[PDB]
Amino acid sequence: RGILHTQLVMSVVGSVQMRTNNGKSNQRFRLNPSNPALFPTLAYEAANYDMYRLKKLTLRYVPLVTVQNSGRVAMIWDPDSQDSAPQSRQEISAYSRSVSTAVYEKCSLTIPADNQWRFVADNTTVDRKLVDFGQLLFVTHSGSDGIETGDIFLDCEVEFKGPQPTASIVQKTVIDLGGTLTSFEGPSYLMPPDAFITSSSFGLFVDVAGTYLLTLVVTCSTTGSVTVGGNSTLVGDGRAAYGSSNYIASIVFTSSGVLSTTPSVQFSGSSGVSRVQMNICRCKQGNTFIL
């Protein structure tokens, strides 16, 4: 028999109007084990292999808030991985596997598994449709806007066929003025609508809920302070440096996955930001820098 793995997926933040996978597109919750959002602990095993096959899948929304904040969390599975995110509130019952209850009460949803071996995404494939097992979509619509409602767990029995040299679990992203985040050599901790640069400032929203390690490489002309807040606190040893036209810093912070209308990591005060290069690693608290 296999081994179950309970894994944290989201911290569900409620909404008033209508909202999909909360701040993000219909790209986040792909059913591949090469996805840090749905698989925070199996992505390290998924870097060693190229074929997977799912056996048991349950979603387990567990509430956290007091029973005073009305809401409706829905959990939806697609067989596609390229269908668009749902548009209305009432385009929810038209899916195949769906559980939609109130915010304050726990749920469950079982997903029937196939028997086909599928590729583990270390790419840059064009068709995600034939690779993934499907999407997971999470919808909130009543109210109780800025409140951590609950959190969604996920249980798996994943087996892997033929191995591989390890896919490098360190991102590498580049921003230009007017550009977006563009990943390089994987994985997908950051999605492209997660950052912004100006002529003087810089910011990153991080919602995967881990403890990470940055290496800022920012091309500016003056120095700038680096503040960490909103979703994440410093494991406070953030040592930066200046020199030539580069700006180099290294940060250890612990995000919490919750949305906020403040960037998690923010760089301000400088002038003429042109490029920002990143590396994120998912480290632990012992990887700080002694003053």
Residues 82 to 141 in contact with a second copy, rule: CB under 8 A: 82-98, 100-106, 119, 122-127, 129-131, 141
Q: Is 155 in the site for a second copy (CB under 8 A)?
A: yes
For residue 189, count other CB atoms closer than 10 A to its CB.
Answer: 24
Give the residue, chosen from 27, 50, 131, 135, that forms a contact with Ca ion under the rule CB under 5 A.
Answer: 50
Smallest distance, a second copy to C-beta of residue 60, A = 5
Q: Is 284 in the site for a second copy (CB under 8 A)?
A: yes
Q: Which residue has the tokens 């509130």?
A: 89
For residue 288, count other CB atoms closer than 10 A to its CB.
Answer: 18
Measured in whole angstroms, how far is the alpha carbon of residue 228 from the centre of its chain?
A: 18
Compare residues 69 and 200 and give the one whose CB is closer to a second copy: 69
Which DSSP category does 117 fall into?
-
Residues 96 to 125 in contact with Ca ion, rule: CB under 5 A: 122
Smallest distance, Ca ion to C-beta of residue 114, A = 17
Stretch that binds a second copy, among 27-35, 164-172, 197-205, 265-273 (CB under 8 A): 164-172
Stretch that binds a second copy, among 27-35, 188-196, 232-240, 262-270 (CB under 8 A): 232-240
What residue 268 binds from Ca ion, a second copy, none (CB within 5 to 8 A, per partner kind)?
Answer: none
Q: Is 274 in the site for a second copy (CB under 8 A)?
A: no
Indicate the SS3 state at residue 230: coil
Residues 186 to 215 in contact with a second copy, rule: CB under 8 A: 186, 208-211, 213, 215
For residue 50, count other CB atoms closer than 10 A to its CB.
Answer: 18
Q: In one letter, which amino acid is 190?
A: L
- With CA atoms as reference, report the closest residue to 13 among 53, 50, 64: 64
Residue 174's H or E segment, with its range, is strand 173-176
Backbone angles phi, psi at 46, to 5 degrees: -75, -15
Which residues are at the interface with Ca ion (CB under 5 A)?
50, 80, 83, 122, 164
